[PDB]
């Protein structure tokens with residue numbers, strides 16, 4: 001019943017492929033919802 | 047829906063009571079509403095509990 005979020009931003013100047021390197025993820029907010037989640041869709045500004 | 051009117055000269059029983067019931071819902075989600083928590087002063091160099 002908890003929704004964990006982790007985020008990390010890296011300042012690496014690689015063009016396209018996923019960088020070959022190691023970097024951890026820190027927790028942002030562990031908030032309760034208590035509701036099942038089954039689908040996912042993203043939003044981009046237009 | 048009949049009228050519910052009052053005057054200050056009304057006696058006990060006819061005096062209106064403002065009633066609030068603090069009901070609650072539990073056991074269907076992780077607990078989110080709790081009470082206050084005690085805070086005490088820390089102690090150094092003495093083995094405490």
Ligand SMILES: *[C@@H]1O[C@H](CO)[C@@H](O)[C@H](O)[C@H]1NC(C)=O
Nearest residue numbers: 033034035036037038074075
């Ligand atoms: C989540 O799924 C369970 C599976 O049985 C169901 O009982 C429950 O009602 C569902 N809750 C929500 C918020 O979808």
